[model samples]
Target: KTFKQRRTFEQRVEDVRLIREQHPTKIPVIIERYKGEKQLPVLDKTKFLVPDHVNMSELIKIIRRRLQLNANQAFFLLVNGHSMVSVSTPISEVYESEKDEDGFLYMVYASQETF
Candidate 1:
């Protein structure tokens, strides 16, 4: 099940509140691999406490490193399930509008696939 599906609404709200109070400067994020994805390796962890000022490109780089992707592989992050954030956009900005009801910014990552 997805992260949201695994928690109750109350549990989620409380989780977010506690994290926000604990780390005021960091944003909570839940990133997972696309369901149909086969080319990319799975991330060891899905929960990330990202700096609010970090941009998408920087975040992607970190993720790439964690997954040990090669330079030839292309990676992309999708906010929620369909919307893509700009590479230069700050994490806070994306979180402000794209955050889930539970208060965590959810993202799905995937690589370009051959047809």
Candidate 2:
């Protein structure tokens, strides 16, 4: 189950508050595999604390390296299930605009095609 589904609203809020309290320089994010997606593998850990200064492309590269994706392979990271962010957008800006009620930014990753 996704983190939001697993935890109550109070729990989610508490978790975010604590994480932000400890890591004020970072953005709290949750990345999940798209339910209908079959090409990409599940991430070992969905929770992330990304630097506020990192751009969307930088974050994409981080995840790409984690999955060890080939240069020709392509994937999309959707924010809050609706917005597909531009590469140059800063993590902080996206978080400010798309963070959930519990204060964590949610994203879903999916591949362009199956192997």
Candidate 3:
């Protein structure tokens, strides 16, 4: 293999530490609610928190409840120029070097074909 770099025990431990103690400590997510969803106020710039180490998938329920969104609604979250994020992606990994200087991770939400 050209470069099968592996982490040393020390590095692994330190990486774990760095991962656990995320740079921001608390994830800042900017939500963009579609205009059609009028039941709630415009989430054009709604910011919220997510704990470090918690995978993105885990927050689905909390967001739904916050928006009072129905289970049937088809919604998805995008990151970094419309890249749809996977549920298994860790919150911390997504924030590293990606959040704005203001500590906010911008995300777009599309619900029920509302664009």
Candidate 4:
């Protein structure tokens, strides 16, 4: 059932019409490829970190495994915000400081991937 072998504009239109009829309440769909300037690595942590007790070391290990990154791989963090708990504050609130009691000054890196 491959469409590459038989795809045609009319067939595509009919398929779209059927899809719309089946899901009349749904919104229109728009598909687009990535057009960003920055390229980010894809990191999966399932193999390296436990779900409940993840720490800095575990996070690093996961990143290394997923990206096939070596120890020399350079990584930097982008601070966005902080936690809501009374004992913990957000990163945006304390970005100017050197460090925090709960080590909130550490960097948080983001990887892009399809979930």
Number of the top lDDT candidate: 2
Model 4 worst lDDT window (10 residues) = 28-37
Where model 1 places Cα greater than 4 Å from the true spot, the runs are 113-115
Native-structure RMSD, model 1 = 2.0
Which residue pairs of candidate 2 clash? Answer: none
lDDT of 4 by residue, 19-95 (tens): 45765433222111123314445433211112323433444455456567566555433322332123133322333
Tell me the spans in candidate 4 whose CA falls farther than 4 Å from its real position: 1-40, 43-50, 78-115
- Cα lDDT, model 1, residue 45: 81
Residue lDDT tens for model 2, 47-67:
999999999999999999988
* Number of the candidate with higher TM-score, 2 or 3: 2
Give me the runs in candidate 3 sitting further than 4 Å from their true place. Answer: 1-24, 34-45, 112-114
Model 2 scores what on Cα lDDT?
A: 0.87
TM-score of each: 0.90, 0.92, 0.60, 0.29
**Pick by lDDT: 1 or 2, better one:** 2
In model 1, the worst 10-residue window by lDDT is 106-115
